[PDB]
């Protein structure tokens, strides 16, 4: 019932005890406009996040489940998004299921309807290219310790050094936010790496923040639809609060009114005998008692 707070398991959820998972949610409060009360995605933030994802980190990762056209109202316009995404190529080998629709036999410029594939054809190609470790697919990445913060923390937590007794193999890097604090990703965010279109200063915390906002935006439950659904929840709750009194009037006051009955019992001493009571009564389940009980 009471779960110790220093075991490394948050609220009793065992596992993830070789990770730093409470940062930003339980210990510390990183502010994300999406999850604030009556909050929403910052359009500029998601725009810059897609810019940084395309110019970097799209060369190893991808969102096979997602497609670019999700960014058509809050992050980009159709023409702008088409122009931006036409800088990349997809071979038919990328397609997960051609189904006779994709008739191309050579590389072609991506369209906004295309799924976000990595530059590699398959997972094994990416795993081979990255030292035998596969850059995880960012679709459905919401399910990580810390949620939206997970992208932000890992991209930034390359500062600490390993303790005694922990060995980082060559080609591996220490990052306390990853499982077992060893990650195969070299640090990617560096100040000035990406030149934003709006002129926002490009410091690694800013790039990490924008990437996290975009990755979260591409999710389905905690993504671009959560704020509106939360507002809908608020409206429905207000409606229920407003309807409670009318429910009370309909049900409880009405029942109390129906029970305002006056009863009277008199003394009937006429010759009539109470033979109906002695010989009477019907039981709907009598067929279950006949020949079985009290014989």
């Amino acid at each position: 019932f009471i779960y110790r707070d220093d075991i490394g398991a948050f609220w009793g959820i065992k596992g993830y005890e070789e990770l730093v998972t409470e940062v930003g949610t339980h210990k510390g409060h990183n502010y994300w406009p999406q999850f604030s009360f009556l909050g929403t995605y910052d359009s500029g933030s998601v725009r810059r996040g897609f810019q940084v994802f395309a110019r970097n980190c799209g060369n190893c990762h991808g969102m096979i489940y997602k497609k670019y056209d999700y960014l058509l109202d809050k992050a980009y316009r159709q023409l702008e998004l088409a122009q931006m995404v036409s800088d990349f190529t997809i071979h038919p080998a990328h397609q997960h299921f051609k189904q006779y629709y994709y008739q191309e036999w050579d590389e072609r410029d991506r369209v906004i309807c295309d799924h976000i594939y990595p530059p590699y054809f398959s997972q094994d190609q990416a795993k081979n290219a990255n030292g035998g470790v596969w850059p995880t697919d960012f679709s459905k990445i919401k399910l990580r310790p810390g949620g939206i913060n997970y992208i932000y923390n890992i991209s930034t937590g390359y500062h600490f050094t390993p303790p005694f007794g922990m060995d980082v193999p060559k080609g591996k890097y220490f990052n306390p936010y990853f499982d077992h604090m060893i990650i195969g990703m070299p640090r990617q965010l560096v100040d000035g790496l990406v030149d934003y279109d709006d002129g926002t200063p490009a410091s690694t915390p800013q790039m990490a923040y924008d990437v996290s906002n975009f990755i979260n935006f591409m999710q389905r439950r905690v993504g671009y639809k959560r704020p509106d659904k939360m507002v809908r929840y608020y409206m429905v709750f207000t409606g229920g609060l407003l309807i409670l009194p009318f429910k009370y009037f309909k049900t409880k006051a009405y029942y109390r009114n129906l029970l305002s009955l006056r009863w009277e019992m008199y003394a009937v001493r006429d010759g009539v005998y109470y033979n109906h009571f002695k010989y009477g009564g019907y039981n709907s389940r009598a067929y279950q008692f006949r020949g079985y009980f009290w014989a």
Binding site: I64, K140, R144, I243, Y287
Partner: protein, 284 residues
């Protein structure tokens, strides 16, 4: 079959309509309304699951992508999926509260037999359907659930002669297994409605909101006097659940139990066995 004497009620449309238009319900409290909440959640589960079935292609390798893509291109699909999940949660909650309430009142008497067992059977079936539903997610949670169920099924046969193949083909989620389990899930989910109707007809024989025998003879007419109260109590409990979920579950959370549902069958081979956990209702 001379041993079978008959049926308590003939569930014909004419007689069902007459019975529900002439039904009377004695004055009651909220504690004795968990059955109605369970039935209403069952109805909403039927509707939402029917809506979901038109989106789910039973091929394991397409279910994740299909779910992700059809939430955007189609409106209300993710709403129906969320409604289905929360309906399962509330259905378990209401069913267990009903079970506890009926255990409290000492309803093990003979006159309650038909009322009791018909209910439990429904509950039992309600378990099976839920299991099948989990399999349709095609995540690592579904993989583990299917593996455990297959091992339990194979326990009875001492691991001889692959008697499980007709349902749990290879003990893995593939096209055949997913198709069969999805169809069985749909059929048994719809059968649950009839089982619940039979149980509701049976239980009215001796229905009591409290153990004490109130001497009242007048009763409420079900159609609106009792139905309105049942709907209102459902609304109140839903408001309470919304408040509790809103405050107990912060918008972003660390170390949730859904984190084991990240892995999708086929896409991810390695399974993080360190953190294996089912939904709270199958947690015990």
């Amino acid at each position: 079959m001379e041993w079978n004497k008959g049926t308590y009620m003939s569930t014909s449309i004419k007689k069902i309509v007459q019975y529900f238009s002439v039904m009377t319900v004695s004055f009651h409290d909220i504690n004795s309304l968990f059955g109605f909440f369970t039935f209403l959640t069952i109805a909403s589960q039927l509707v939402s699951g029917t809506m979901l079935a038109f989106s789910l292609v039973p091929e394991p390798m397409l279910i994740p992508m299909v779910r992700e893509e059809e939430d955007v291109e189609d409106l209300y699909t993710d709403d129906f999926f969320w409604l289905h999940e929360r309906g399962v949660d509330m259905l378990f909650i209401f069913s267990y509260f009903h079970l506890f309430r009926k255990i409290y009142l000492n309803n093990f008497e003979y006159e309650q037999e038909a009322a009791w067992k018909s209910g439990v059977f429904t509950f039992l079936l309600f378990q099976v359907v839920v299991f099948l539903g989990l399999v349709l997610c095609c995540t690592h949670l579904s993989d583990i659930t299917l593996a455990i169920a297959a091992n339990l099924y194979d326990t009875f046969f001492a691991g001889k002669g692959k008697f499980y193949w007709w349902i749990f083909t290879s003990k893995e989620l593939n096209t055949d297994t997913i198709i069969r389990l999805a169809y069985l899930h749909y059929v048994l989910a719809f059968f649950l409605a009839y089982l619940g109707l039979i149980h509701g007809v049976d239980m009215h024989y001796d229905w009591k909101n409290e153990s004490s025998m109130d001497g009242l003879e007048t009763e409420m007419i079900w159609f609106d006097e009792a139905l309105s109260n049942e709907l209102g109590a459902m609304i109140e409990i839903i408001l309470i659940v919304m408040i509790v979920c809103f405050f107990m579950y912060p918008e972003p959370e660390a170390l949730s139990y859904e984190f084991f549902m990240w892995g999708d069958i086929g896409f991810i081979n390695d399974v993080r066995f360190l953190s294996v956990a089912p939904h709270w209702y199958f947690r015990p």
